[PDB]
Amino acid sequence: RLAQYGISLAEVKSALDASNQEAGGSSIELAEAEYMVRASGYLQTLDDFNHIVLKASENGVPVYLRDVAKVQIGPEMRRGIAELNGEGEVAGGVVILRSGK
């Protein structure tokens, strides 16, 4: 899909890296009151990923991330593995005591 749409890996990473952060634009006075200006832009929907702009022609026709990638929820590179009674893998936790207490 990359080649087909004419998009390099780098073009993707860069665009991705600029479609997931909030920004504040000072405040403003109305009825003698402070009005903070919050600018949304946080990723939190799969569609948001699927709607990460990559390329846009003059036409106004854009090319989203959904055109070169499926956005699936998966597991990270596991570092620790926990098993219980040899009948299932589970998540756990260990309480660390401050040495000498």
Partner: protein
């Protein structure tokens, strides 16, 4: 289930299309107040020429 918004643009009717060429060679006598961008109407004078 689907629900997607497709982008679109407004353009000229390409079935309502007309290019006005002179039937035969000649020189322009005068040209009316009319430039690219103006809205004309069927019958509007374009230019007077001698052939």
């Amino acid at each position: 289930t689907f629900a997607q918004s497709f982008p679109a643009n407004v353009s000229y009717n390409e079935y309502q299309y007309a290019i006005v060429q002179a039937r035969a060679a000649g020189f322009i006598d005068k040209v009316y107040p009319l430039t690219v961008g103006d809205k004309v109407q069927k019958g509007t004078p374009l230019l007077d020429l001698t052939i």
